[PDB]
């Protein structure tokens, strides 16, 4: 319990996420206090919308806290993949958020819900201000497991701004909002696609994109080593963000210098950025 | 285009997933013809079929391990899909409680429950070998679908609460999908395989007992697809140790434990 707040104060992004979580929790309380009246029709709707938002930012914060934990027997590599999992889950959150706002625009076009005194209009201004303060705060551009937490919540807040200006466009129109909903859903899905593609690449044990170009040259260099007959079962994959793990098997001469070949292979693949490397050396029979 | 159906016909799991995709696509046309959640359900088993299709593709330079993690990703995305389906069903139950046309009395839901019964009769189950995860996902999905079917005729029972029944079904299917998401998160986080974890201290003590092995370190084991375990290991051995014999014995020891892909790096100590 108490150590979590000692962990929440260790990291800048962690304290920012905690402040954001407290802010939407306060928003949830005040919005509930507004919806206990008879105007609950859209109040409960954007209430479960922001509730999802809170679940998204809670998942991001939980991943940020967990990612610094030490290794154990169960988790050999640590908890550094929580960052990638958070990015993936946040992208999925935004996809279903696009679908939900599509349904919202559809029902706004079809059924007239106008039993209200535009309380949500001023509340929408508060939500847009919250999105703006978030976009100002969260502007960004073995170890090192932090590259993907920022992008997911930043993309989520970009969506939240688009959901916020959707109702502004609706108010402009009434003096069509389904068209604005279509536009914002398509735009945030287009923005989401790179994050989902990168997370899918990492989580499918794919050769790192920053490593794939240099690997033919590395294989050629290791082949040129004295006494190396063949080079087989090459697997490179991304752990967290900047950590590349490589596994390699070498077939060498019956009397080759395994010490020198091992050191040179480690040097060759360390120069390419592979931090963790396993070189199995097999002495060929004649 | 044409080769996709041939791949579908080749796999038996992909064989059910194609016609089961056909039944709701027909059920969508019937529902649309009546109208003049479910399309989400069409997406979920579409990912289940796509994972079964993508999974047996050949390895290349970019995907060194193949495409066998698509199955774990599909189980993960089905779990997340069912979590969100439960939350939206909770919301829909709230709307039902707060706020009737009765065309056909929604008796089509009974034949829908029959379709889910057919699915649960059919999808009942209990490098290579890449199929364990899609079946569990479709099974707990169709179980959630049967519970959603029971929701409506529970409402019919009461009107002669459906929000309470929605609460019950959402909680129950979340409990049902908790183990699948737990296993998928374990696999996707490079956790040591739970079936292999108990055998690993024994294997460490067996490899340490090999003649000329000094230290054993940087042991990393993780799950690829479902039954394929990948292990990496580093050994410090004597300056004149039999590296061929040590490598063969280490490979035998960890192969007996269930590791299919193993990389043992042997370092020769300086005295």
């Amino acid at each position: 319990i108490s150590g979590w707040f000692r962990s929440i104060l260790s990291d800048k992004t962690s304290r920012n996420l905690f402040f954001f979580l407290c802010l939407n929790l306060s928003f949830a309380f005040v919005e509930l206090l507004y919806g206990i009246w008879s105007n609950c029709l859209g109040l409960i709707s954007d209430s479960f919308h922001m509730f999802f938002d809170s679940t998204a930012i809670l998942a991001g914060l939980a991943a940020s806290v967990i990612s610094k934990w030490r290794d154990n027997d169960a988790f050999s590599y640590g908890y550094v993949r929580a960052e990638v999992l958070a990015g993936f889950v946040n992208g999925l959150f935004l996809i279903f958020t696009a679908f939900f706002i599509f349904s919202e625009g559809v029902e706004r076009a079809l059924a007239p819900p106008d039993v209200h005194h535009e309380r949500l209009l001023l509340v929408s201004i508060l939500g847009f201000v919250v999105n703006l303060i978030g976009i100002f705060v969260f502007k960004h551009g073995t170890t090192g497991p932090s590259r993907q937490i920022l992008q997911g919540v930043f993309l989520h807040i970009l969506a939240d701004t688009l959901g916020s200006i959707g109702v502004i466009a609706s108010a402009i129109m009434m003096q069509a909002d389904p068209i604005c909903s279509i536009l914002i859903a398509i735009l945030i899905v287009v923005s989401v696609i790179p994050l989902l593609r990168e997370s899918v690449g990492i989580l499918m044990q794919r050769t790192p994109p920053l490593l794939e170009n240099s690997l033919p040259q590395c294989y050629q260099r290791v082949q040129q080593l004295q006494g190396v007959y063949s080079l087989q079962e090459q697997h490179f994959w991304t752990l967290c963000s900047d950590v590349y793990v490589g596994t390699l098997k070498l077939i060498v001469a019956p009397d080759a210098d395994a010490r020198w070949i091992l050191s040179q292979t480690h040097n060759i693949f360390t120069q390419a950025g592979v931090r963790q490397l396993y070189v199995q050396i097999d002495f060929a029979a004649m | 285009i044409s080769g996709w159906f041939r791949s579908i016909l080749s796999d038996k799991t992909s064989r059910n997933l194609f016609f089961f995709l056909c039944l709701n696509l027909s059920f969508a046309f019937v529902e649309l013809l009546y109208g003049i959640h479910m399309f989400f359900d069409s997406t979920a088993i579409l990912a289940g079929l796509a994972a079964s299709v993508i999974s047996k593709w050949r390895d290349n330079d970019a995907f060194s391990y193949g495409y066998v993690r698509a199955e774990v990703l599909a189980g993960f995305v089905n779990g997340l899909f069912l979590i969100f389906t439960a939350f939206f069903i909770f919301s829909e139950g709230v709307e039902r409680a707060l706020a009737v046309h009765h065309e056909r009395l929604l008796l089509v839901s009974i034949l829908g429950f029959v379709v889910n019964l057919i699915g649960i009769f059919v999808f009942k189950h209990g490098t290579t070998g890449p199929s364990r995860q899609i079946l569990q996902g479709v099974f707990l999905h169709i179980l959630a679908d049967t519970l959603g079917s029971i929701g409506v005729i529970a409402s019919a029972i009461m009107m002669q609460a459906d929000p309470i029944c929605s609460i019950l079904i959402a909680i129950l299917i979340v409990v049902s999908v908790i183990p699948l998401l737990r296993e998928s998160v374990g696999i996707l986080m490079q956790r040591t395989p739970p079936l292999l974890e108990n055998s690993l201290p024994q294997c460490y003590q067996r490899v340490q007992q090999l003649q000329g092995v000094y230290s054993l370190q940087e042991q990393h084991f993780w799950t690829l697809c479902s039954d394929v375990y990948v292990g990496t290991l580093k050994l410090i051995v004597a300056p004149d140790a039999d590296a061929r014999w040590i490598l063969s014995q280490t490979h035998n020891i960890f192969t007996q434990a269930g590791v299919r892909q193993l990389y043992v790096q042997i370092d020769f100590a300086a005295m």
Partner: antibody, heavy 118, light 112 residues
């Protein structure tokens, strides 16, 4: 009783080829590498190349264009061929067995003096 | 190429004394705790004889009076005590980078 004997022409006129055969005894060429090293007063010791058990050969970077080393396991002979001789290559050529699992040469042969003159 | 410079070019030492030959490498010949520097002895009119492999290990069958030490770029070959048979030229050879390069030999002279 590891033996390395070399038989080559003492006199080779410039801009022709030199052929040295290294006959080995006491060990097999199917599990040992044989290095080629020449020694001349002007250039001290120089490393020519190595032939491995499976036939893979690694040469010196300067001599890659004009060097060729062959092997045959059956009669246990390593053939050394070097083309386009000048006065520089006047040196005592050795064939040496590679120290197993290390980068040194443990057992050498009685070097044959090769003289390049007209 | 890694050049190897030996100092001194010639060394004069008396019997039952201590003789030190140093080899200097332009680039480090060390990798992962091992230094791939080797010491050869070439007497009068025979091919060189291996003494030290990897800069610290005595070749099997050579006298224990020979010693090797050093790392990175500095290496030292020590003969203690020095006999009359040790009048030879000593070379240092690196095997950390292709092509294999030797050093200019150092001649040991037995003072009497």
């Amino acid at each position: 009783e590891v033996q390395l004997q070399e038989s080559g022409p003492g006199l080779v006129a410039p801009s022709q080829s030199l052929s040295i055969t290294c006959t080995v005894s006491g060990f097999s060429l199917t599990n040992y590498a044989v290095h080629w090293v020449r020694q001349s007063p002007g250039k001290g010791l120089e490393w020519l190349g190595v032939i491995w058990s499976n036939g893979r050969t690694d040469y010196n970077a300067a001599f890659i264009s004009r060097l060729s080393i062959s092997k045959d396991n059956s009669k246990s002979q390593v053939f050394f061929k070097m083309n386009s001789l000048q006065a520089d290559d006047t040196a005592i050529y050795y064939c040496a067995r590679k120290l197993a699992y290390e980068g040194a040469m443990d057992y050498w042969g009685q070097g044959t003096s090769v003289t390049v003159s007209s | 190429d890694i050049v190897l410079t030996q100092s001194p070019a010639s060394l004069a030492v008396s019997l039952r004394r201590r003789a030190t030959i140093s080899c200097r490498a332009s680039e480090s010949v060390d990798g992962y705790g091992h230094s791939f520097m080797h010491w050869y002895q070439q007497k009068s009119g025979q091919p060189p004889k291996l003494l030290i492999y990897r800069a610290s290990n005595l070749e099997s069958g050579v006298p224990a009076r020979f010693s090797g030490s050093g790392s990175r770029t500095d290496f030292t070959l020590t003969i203690d005590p020095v006999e009359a048979d040790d009048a030879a030229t000593y070379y240092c050879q690196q095997s950390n980078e292709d092509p294999y390069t030797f050093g200019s030999g150092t001649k040991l002279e037995i003072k009497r």
